[PDB]
Design a protein around this ligand. Structure first.
Ligand SMILES: O=C(O)CNC(=O)c1nc(Cl)c2ccccc2c1O
Ligand code: NI
Ligand code: NI
Ligand code: NI
Ligand code: NI
Lengths: 236, 240, 242, 235
């Protein structure tokens, strides 16, 4: 079970594993360890997988349930991870991006850390769901500080509309800087696992009207907490 | 001596005082108190003041030496205050703007305080002066925090070009909010005194190609210190 | 009747006129001419005016009915001008800002004219009025081109959120530039008249929470037309009546 | 001899051709067509190349001489295309991005076309040259956005506006749907049309070594839609 490093700050490929429900404990711990470290992990050659096999494999890692986003951040208890499989890919394009929000934080100048540590964003959906998340959250498992932003961010608490947009785009520019991202060229039998609590992702609509079907199993999450132990606030 | 507020966050007009080199200590203590409190103070009908009589008066406040700026912040020990007198005005226009950078800091959300308190800016003169000032200085006399920025800020330390211009303009917008500024319509024999340690100012070129003349006496200042007690840093040049 | 510039781009003071319904028709022509030329005009020491006499004077100019805005641009036929009179001023502060959107357009570099001439904007009251105005309207009387924007602007047609807000701030920066504005220190008896088809205005809340009250009389305006001659489009809400 | 589409707006892979001076002109015409259509073209498994044989193939196209840029736009007669080859790659990362500035222009809302057609940018290195923001491509006749990180300012606009409009343009240009990210493998060769693209290196390999051999071709002076050519300030 080798783990190939793809990029300096994000992405790893994992060889010598056949994803499925009947897997070894020691194997799973290598996967989680690689997931937490590299934020998104990839599995080639997984042509054995159907839905039920992918769902059973997800059950080991946790509890099963365009533009840059963390999935469902308008909700308070937003997903921990996702297992995504290709079933039907187009003849060209259809690649996907991931960004490491843990490394994003780490590389912030200390002034911007000061800012973000104490900053809170209003996440919403465009049935109206509203959550105030901290822009910085501590990762339950790794204890890493990770920026929490993305396209569900409506505004920052306290700041006016102009300041919100401007500061928002400042963070996203760092979060999605090419060095801090990985772009995956999907082939059949590929499976990506990403930590939704330390990443943003983005689909790319570069395959025209071609069909592109994927199968996604999303693991259960938990309410974020900032560096002062403050958890997220609900409204709607 | 009576002092009248002009706006809620800045400006005061002081009557009952003829400015000159020979003034009562108690009176100059009331002027300074008003200057520190209101950041800019205006004197009507000071027709007796010529260059020499102005220079004298300024010497009771300290030691004698268009875009929103704080005067000469590309130097480490930039001036504390200035006395500006009108002599030849235009027939219309030619007002001047002042911004209270102390009230600006106070109005900030806590997130932007965190930022500004720890943010440091490189001020330059496009002689090659270069100075790393804090974005927040503690005022030597009032102890108030004041935002230190303006048109001499080339960049912020640790941030790139884009982040800099972005945050620069975010700060300047809050500083130059109309409610945090005052526009002075110059009449002849008007004298303005402003605290350069707690303000920005801007001249308005709305008098076409008419002649304009003012007389400025600028006072010696000290090196700023951040909220932790760290001084500004001379990269190039020498103190004033 | 004298009319005095208060600035190169905007503002003028008019003295030598007792305002009221019994005004000399030739004097009204000079008022109107000044208003169109200088965008906002001020009268000092008009202590004789009241609600009734102001409304009467207004009727000679046209038909009667904080942050930078043109008045009620969320409607299609937004006012042509307004007459504003002080009744009760605070002891300090309370000054008001005007910006010249005609001068603003004139100063635009050619590329930015290309953009603005061809740019439309959705205005809204944040009742549910929603209107697509041109960012440049041709002025009925003067024939001048004026930038039409302000705080009611929600977005620009054909452009996404980021682009819209970015370009919006580009224009507002030019409009509200100090050179292109005037700030009025209100005294009792002061009256201000401005052309709402060629200006934005902004109240300044720099008087804490002291008591302030003005009285305003607003005139009827027409629907803006772009340089090509296309008129503003109503999406929701009725035009202004009376 | 086949050419495969990599993404809707940009990117092509050309398989079944050995690059070098020893190539049928008929193949060169099929390669040039792809380069003009797809803006960047990729050759897998070109293990048998070297500095001499890359240069010979570059001559068949024309006349031989990190952040989002078009190469050497501070110059006026800046390059037409480049042939880049991997000689020694890091163990991980080292990818490169290309953006299609022709597709960028086409996607613009009509108001932004008004602007960009009439807009001019001062390009510089930290030489100086005033280029049109929209150039007409000499071969294809397509209108392409011309910007990148050599742009200091736009002619007639102040610093703030220039800066703020610049990011509006670059944001569209570098929109993922308009780009391609290439994972470099041994013996890979890319040719890109520098007149219709931007490119960006990705420094995501810590302190590792990515040696690349580039061969750049001669390119003519840009012209705007009105026919006005670029003005040189500092030659
Ligand atoms: O005092 C002033 O600056 C004049 N006020 C206005 O033009 C004005 N405009 C609008 Cl759109 C509103 C809108 C709502 C309430 C008061 C308003 C107002 O006084
Ligand atoms: Ni998603
Ligand atoms: Ni100055
Ligand atoms: Ni109004
Ligand atoms: Ni290059």
């Amino acid at each position: 079970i080798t783990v190939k490093k793809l990029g300096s700050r994000i992405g790893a490929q994992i060889d010598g594993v056949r994803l499925g429900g009947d897997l070894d404990p020691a194997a799973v711990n290598e996967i989680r360890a690689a997931l937490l470290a590299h934020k998104v992990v990839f599995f080639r050659g997984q042509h054995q997988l159907d839905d039920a096999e992918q769902l059973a494999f997800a059950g080991l890692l946790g509890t099963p349930i365009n533009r840059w986003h963390t999935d469902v951040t308008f909700a308070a208890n937003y997903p921990a991870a996702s297992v995504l499989r290709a079933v039907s890919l187009p003849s060209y394009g259809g690649s996907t991006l991931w960004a490491n929000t843990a490394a994003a934080y780490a590389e912030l100048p200390e002034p911007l850390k000061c800012l973000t540590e104490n900053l809170w964003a209003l996440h919403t959906n465009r049935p109206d769901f509203r959550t105030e998340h901290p822009v910085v959250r501590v990762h339950p498992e790794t204890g890493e500080r990770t920026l929490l932003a993305g396209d569900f961010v409506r505004s920052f608490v306290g700041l006016d509309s102009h300041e919100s947009r401007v500061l928002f785009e400042v963070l996203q520019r760092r979060i999605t800087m090419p060095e801090n991202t990985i772009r995956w060229n999907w082939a059949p039998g590929d499976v990506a696992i990403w930590d939704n609590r330390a990443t943003q992702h983005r689909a790319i609509d570069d395959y025209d009207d071609q069909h592109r079907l994927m199968h996604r199993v999303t693991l259960m999450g938990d309410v974020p907490v900032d560096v002062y132990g403050q958890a997220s606030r609900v409204i709607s």
